[PDB]
Amino acid sequence: AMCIPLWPARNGNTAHLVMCPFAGGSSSAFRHWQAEQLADCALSLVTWPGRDRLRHLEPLRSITQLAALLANELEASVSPDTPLLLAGHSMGAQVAFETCRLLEQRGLAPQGLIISGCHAPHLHSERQLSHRDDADFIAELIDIGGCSPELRENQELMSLFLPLLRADFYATESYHYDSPDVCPPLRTPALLLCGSHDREASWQQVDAWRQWLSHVTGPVVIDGDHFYPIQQARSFFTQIVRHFPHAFS
């Protein structure tokens, strides 16, 4: 399964929040979330094929391919009686959006979509990595914030990580539409989140998601940098719960 549980539901809550991770983010990226359940919904993290317990698979190189895998899994595994919330940050926002698109088409719209820290699909990120050689690629990764310079000093780590990181960044950078009118807007209620000091996604880049979303609140600004879903988890989940009161009973 792509989805791995992080929180069980508690206090009788029936909602299930499914989180799509960062580009190159890993299992370990979200241990901080497992340390303390901040809301009563069940909470699962999506694993891209090619790493963690799915390392026996080749990494996919397309946002829409990831979304098709995830939409099928959720359609098979989530009871239609379960209020479903789809969330994603950075590249995960693109997968969450496209997954929501497929579920919505199928008559299985989730109760909510949370788009965090990501430019809209008709835009390109101002940071671009896929054209760079390995040294430059890693320097961008370090600049983003979730990568040790130790990676540069070990060809074996580089041979392990770079195909995964490069696959992720190719996927998220090649993901682009010429115009919002290429698809009908999504009707699933949506929340836009962005960070006050997030260098990967400005308020304007996230606000542009309103071209694709019929029922949207935000951007709601969380005080933090690109890692605010982790470093400011309390604000992150507070804003999610607040904006989806139906789904949290």
Tab-separated table of C-alpha atoms in Angstrom, residues 5 10 16 31-32 37-38 50 56-57 82 86 96 100 108 111 132 140 172 175 187-188 199 209 228 239:
chain	number	residue	atom	x	y	z
A	5	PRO	CA	-0.825	5.022	9.164
A	10	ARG	CA	-9.500	8.683	18.447
A	16	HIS	CA	-9.168	10.214	7.739
A	31	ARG	CA	8.397	11.279	12.773
A	32	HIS	CA	7.694	14.579	14.545
A	37	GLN	CA	-1.421	13.314	17.731
A	38	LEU	CA	-2.592	16.903	17.163
A	50	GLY	CA	10.946	3.361	-4.882
A	56	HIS	CA	11.316	-2.967	-4.498
A	57	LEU	CA	9.608	-0.642	-7.074
A	82	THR	CA	-15.324	7.861	6.009
A	86	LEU	CA	-6.496	14.893	1.068
A	96	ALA	CA	-3.128	15.512	-3.765
A	100	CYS	CA	-8.755	14.668	-5.751
A	108	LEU	CA	-16.151	9.961	-4.717
A	111	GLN	CA	-14.629	16.166	2.033
A	132	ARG	CA	21.483	20.734	-13.139
A	140	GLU	CA	19.960	23.501	-4.609
A	172	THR	CA	7.185	18.080	-9.961
A	175	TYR	CA	4.081	18.954	-14.088
A	187	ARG	CA	-15.541	21.383	-6.556
A	188	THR	CA	-14.119	19.658	-3.458
A	199	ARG	CA	11.236	30.507	-0.041
A	209	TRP	CA	-4.513	27.840	-7.159
A	228	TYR	CA	6.210	24.725	8.384
A	239	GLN	CA	-5.846	25.494	10.232
